[PDB]
Scaffold this motif. Structure first.
Motif, short mmCIF file in Angstrom:
data_model
loop_
_atom_site.label_atom_id
_atom_site.label_comp_id
_atom_site.label_asym_id
_atom_site.label_seq_id
_atom_site.Cartn_x
_atom_site.Cartn_y
_atom_site.Cartn_z
N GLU A 125 0.82 -1.20 0.00
CA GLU A 125 0.00 0.00 0.00
C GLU A 125 0.86 1.26 0.00
O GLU A 125 0.45 2.30 -0.51
CB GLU A 125 -0.91 0.00 1.23
N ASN A 126 2.06 1.15 0.57
CA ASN A 126 2.99 2.28 0.64
C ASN A 126 3.23 2.86 -0.75
O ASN A 126 3.12 4.07 -0.94
CB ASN A 126 4.31 1.84 1.26
N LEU A 127 3.58 2.01 -1.71
CA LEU A 127 3.80 2.46 -3.07
C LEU A 127 2.49 2.38 -3.85
O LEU A 127 2.47 2.23 -5.07
CB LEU A 127 4.89 1.64 -3.77
N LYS A 128 1.39 2.47 -3.10
CA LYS A 128 0.03 2.44 -3.62
C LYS A 128 -0.27 1.59 -4.85
O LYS A 128 -0.50 2.12 -5.94
CB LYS A 128 -0.45 3.87 -3.86
N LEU A 129 -0.26 0.27 -4.68
CA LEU A 129 -0.58 -0.64 -5.77
C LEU A 129 -1.45 -1.74 -5.17
O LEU A 129 -1.16 -2.24 -4.08
CB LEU A 129 0.70 -1.23 -6.39
N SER A 130 -2.53 -2.08 -5.86
CA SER A 130 -3.46 -3.10 -5.39
C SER A 130 -2.87 -4.50 -5.49
O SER A 130 -1.84 -4.72 -6.12
CB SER A 130 -4.75 -3.04 -6.21
N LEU A 131 -3.53 -5.46 -4.83
CA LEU A 131 -3.08 -6.84 -4.86
C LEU A 131 -3.32 -7.39 -6.25
O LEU A 131 -2.71 -8.37 -6.67
CB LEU A 131 -3.85 -7.67 -3.82
N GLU A 132 -4.23 -6.74 -6.98
CA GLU A 132 -4.53 -7.15 -8.34
C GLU A 132 -3.38 -6.73 -9.24
O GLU A 132 -2.99 -7.46 -10.15
CB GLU A 132 -5.83 -6.50 -8.83
N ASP A 133 -2.83 -5.54 -8.99
CA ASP A 133 -1.71 -5.05 -9.79
C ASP A 133 -0.46 -5.84 -9.45
O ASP A 133 0.37 -6.11 -10.32
CB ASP A 133 -1.47 -3.56 -9.52
N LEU A 134 -0.31 -6.20 -8.18
CA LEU A 134 0.85 -6.96 -7.73
C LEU A 134 0.89 -8.33 -8.39
O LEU A 134 1.95 -8.79 -8.79
CB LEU A 134 0.84 -7.12 -6.21
N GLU A 135 -0.27 -8.96 -8.50
CA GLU A 135 -0.36 -10.28 -9.12
C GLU A 135 -0.16 -10.20 -10.62
O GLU A 135 0.57 -11.01 -11.20
CB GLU A 135 -1.71 -10.92 -8.82
N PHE A 136 -0.82 -9.24 -11.26
CA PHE A 136 -0.71 -9.07 -12.70
C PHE A 136 0.74 -8.80 -13.09
O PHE A 136 1.24 -9.34 -14.08
CB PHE A 136 -1.59 -7.91 -13.17
N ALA A 137 1.40 -7.96 -12.30
CA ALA A 137 2.79 -7.59 -12.54
C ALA A 137 3.74 -8.77 -12.37
O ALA A 137 4.54 -9.07 -13.25
CB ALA A 137 3.20 -6.47 -11.61
N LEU A 138 3.64 -9.44 -11.23
CA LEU A 138 4.52 -10.57 -10.95
C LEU A 138 4.26 -11.87 -11.72
O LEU A 138 5.03 -12.82 -11.60
CB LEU A 138 4.54 -10.85 -9.45
N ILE A 139 3.18 -11.91 -12.50
CA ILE A 139 2.86 -13.12 -13.27
C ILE A 139 3.94 -13.34 -14.32
O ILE A 139 4.19 -14.46 -14.73
CB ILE A 139 1.48 -13.02 -13.99
N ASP A 140 4.57 -12.25 -14.75
CA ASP A 140 5.64 -12.32 -15.74
C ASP A 140 7.00 -12.61 -15.10
O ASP A 140 7.99 -12.82 -15.81
CB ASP A 140 5.71 -11.02 -16.54
N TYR A 141 7.05 -12.61 -13.77
CA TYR A 141 8.30 -12.87 -13.06
C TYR A 141 8.28 -14.18 -12.27
O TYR A 141 9.06 -14.37 -11.34
CB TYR A 141 8.64 -11.68 -12.16
N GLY A 142 7.36 -15.07 -12.63
CA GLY A 142 7.28 -16.36 -11.97
C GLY A 142 6.21 -16.63 -10.93
O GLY A 142 6.14 -17.75 -10.43
N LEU A 143 5.38 -15.65 -10.60
CA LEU A 143 4.32 -15.86 -9.61
C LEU A 143 3.34 -16.95 -10.05
O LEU A 143 2.86 -16.93 -11.18
CB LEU A 143 3.56 -14.55 -9.37
N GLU A 144 3.05 -17.87 -9.14
CA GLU A 144 2.11 -18.95 -9.40
C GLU A 144 0.87 -18.73 -8.54
O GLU A 144 -0.24 -19.15 -8.89
CB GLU A 144 2.72 -20.31 -9.06
N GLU A 145 1.06 -18.05 -7.42
CA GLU A 145 -0.04 -17.77 -6.51
C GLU A 145 0.26 -16.66 -5.52
O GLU A 145 1.41 -16.43 -5.14
CB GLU A 145 -0.42 -19.04 -5.75
#
Length: 220
Positions: A125-145
């Motif tokens: 929340e500090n860098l103001k980004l939703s959990l939806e943005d965090l997941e969408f972003a990290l999906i390209d860096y290996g996030l599975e869940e």
């Protein structure tokens, strides 16, 4: 309890990677973890300096075991004497009926090696980004869940995706509370209260050993 082992990861990482964090990824990861846990600076420094001494001959060894109730155990250890370690572990199992250490590979295909990154919910929340943005972003860096656990976010990915995922977190400038590689059972089992109690006996003796830095079971 927790500092000695976090100190062992800093020493091991330094021995086979160099005492220069800027050029040793594992050392950085070890340092980051110790810091997030609230290990004083001098301690860390003491762990990095230990690698270049007669006390820096550590090694990472994994042992496998089984116990009543269809329990499977993966023990990760860092020790300066594999002989002592294997002997102590055996003394723990040879104290609990129905439990025994088995040859490595016996649990093959029963567990999955995953990259697990823990992050503070308040940091996201500090860098103001939703959990939806965090997941969408990290999906390209290996996030599975992405899972949520009060005050913190836990992101998992395949084992081999460790480095990349770290890249993602650094791209977003998102502080990592803890980064590690964990063994997750493919088919979790649930024990009744009686079974859990009987198993807990053995699991506590192991976890208490100064060489066991990680303990994974197939228990849910």
């Amino acid at each position: 309890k927790v500092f000695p082992k976090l100190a062992k990861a800093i020493t091991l990482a330094a021995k086979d990677g160099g005492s220069e964090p800027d050029t040793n990824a594992k050392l950085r990861t070890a340092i980051l973890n110790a810091k997030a846990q609230n290990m004083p600076k001098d301690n860390i420094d003491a762990a990095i300096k230990r690698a270049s001494s007669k006390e820096g001959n550590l090694s990472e060894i994994t042992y496998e075991g089984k116990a009543n109730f269809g329990v499977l155990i993966i023990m990760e250890c860092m020790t300066d004497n594999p002989t002592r370690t294997i002997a102590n572990l055996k003394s723990y199992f040879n104290k609990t009926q129905g439990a025994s250490i088995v040859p490595n590979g016996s649990l093959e295909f029963m567990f999955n090696r995953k990259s697990v990154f823990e992050c503070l919910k308040n940091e996201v929340e500090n860098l103001k980004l939703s959990l939806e943005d965090l997941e969408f972003a990290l999906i390209d860096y290996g996030l599975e869940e992405l899972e949520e656990v009060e005050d913190k976010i836990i992101i998992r990915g395949d084992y081999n995706s460790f480095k990349l995922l770290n890249e993602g977190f650094e791209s977003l400038k998102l502080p990592i509370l803890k980064a590690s590689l964990q063994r997750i059972a493919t088919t979790p089992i649930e024990l009744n209260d009686e079974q859990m109690e009987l198993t807990e006996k053995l699991l506590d003796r192991i976890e208490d050993d100064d060489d066991v830095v990680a303990l994974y079971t197939n228990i849910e």
